[PDB]
Structure 1
């Protein structure tokens, strides 16, 4: 049971994933929650680079994938082996939507890099938190280098294209308050998980 949250910055992924985490632990699941990029010692070094340094788009791509690879080997595959429910705050669709649809790198190439880093590990469900860009940006404080309107409109569109084309992606209206969104996540999750 691998549950991924996806969506643009300010869709509320981190808030929603921590809520789901604690809710499942309550219900007696064994649960893990990891962020991408990050989630391992090495991945957190890479996250810092990715967030702080001026990178070209090809370097950035390779470092998002390196973070993922480490997280898959070190944490995700061993957790799934142990019947831990694993919740991911971003996963493979983020790389396609940001570095592909956003930055213009080839989506088909990114897919193959994704499969390489993941060893083909796929979520049981992906919750795409969809929200208009203006709404999302208004939730944020400081803007990171990805959190700009022109760019995020392309990213939002790319996620919605992926939801049509990729498997097991459910589109969640994330424009509501925290609990209405959380209830929509639980309704979508009841489709794969008690």
Structure 2
């Protein structure tokens, strides 16, 4: 089964995805954990380009999708066939929120690309880690990571509209303390798997 974490930078996805990976493993699931972009040899090369180079927004979209396509074909589809629980730190809603709502690229076009890269694989559940931008930015600032408030305000709202419009997205209050956040996530998952 497929569990996707989504949300703005500094919402706790890395943290919570790893917490979930260890928890489910301990419970006897066979689990995989992948980040996007990245998660394959080729995707990681693309992730470094995306994080280090000055790119226009079109080229960026196409690289995010290329990384996803490699991950889907190389790892996610084979994992799912073997009944692994696949946990993703970011997936298709990040593309729509960042490239669409943030950068103003066309949302229907993005969805079509998403569908092409995924071969239509969709999550059983998406956990949206919702958090006020200013709180995310203080968390990131502690680790010397700076992100753009005006941009992230639009991205946050994108994610929240997607949570209303798209299937199987649960809005998590990610402003909580780590353990409380994790317990909300467990409650959200409780219907989809044991």
Length-normalised TM-score, structure 2? 0.98
Give, in angstroms, the shift of residue 191 of structure 1.
1.4
Residue 140 of structure 1 aligns to a residue whose secondary structure is: helix
Runs of 4+ in 1 over 3 A off after TM superposition: 141-146
What is the alpha-carbon distance in structure 1 between the residues aligned to residue 57 and residue 41 of structure 2? 23
CA distance in 2, matches of 1:151, 1:47: 20
CA distance, structure 1, for counterparts of residue 99 and residue 105 of structure 2: 6
Matches within 5 A, 1:127-146: 127-141=127-141
1:164 equivalent in structure 2:
164
Query: Shift in Å at residue 123 of structure 1?
Result: 0.1
1:141 Cα deviation from its structure 2 partner: 3.6
Point out where structure 1 has 5 or more consecutive residues left out of the alignment: none
Give, in whole Å, the separation in 1 of the partners of 2:139 and 2:182. Answer: 17
Deviations 1:156-184 (A, max 9, x none): 00000000000000000000110000000
Give the TM-score of the pair, scaled to structure 1.
0.98
Q: Say how many residue pairs are matched.
A: 194
Per the TM alignment, residue 142 of structure 1 is displaced from its structure 2 partner at its CA by 7.9
Contact 1:146-1:152 within 8 A present in 2 as well: no
Residue 85 to residue 37, structure 1, CA distance change in 2 (3 Å): same
Tell me, yes or no, if the aligned pair for 2:101 and 2:154 is still in contact at 8 Å: yes
- CA contact under 8 A between 1:51 and 1:144: conserved in structure 2? no
Equivalent residue number for residue 103 of structure 1: 103
Q: Deviations over 1:84-132 (max 9, x none)?
A: 0000000000000000000000000000000000000000000000000
Q: 1:54/1:16 Cα in 2 relative to 1: closer, same or farther (>3 Å)?
A: same
CA deviation string 1:125-147 (max 9, x = no partner)? 00000000000010004899982
Q: Which stretch of structure 1 is more off in the superposition, 45-54 or 139-148? A: 139-148
Could you list the runs of 5+ residues in structure 2 that have no partner in the other structure?
none
SS, match of residue 69 in structure 2: helix
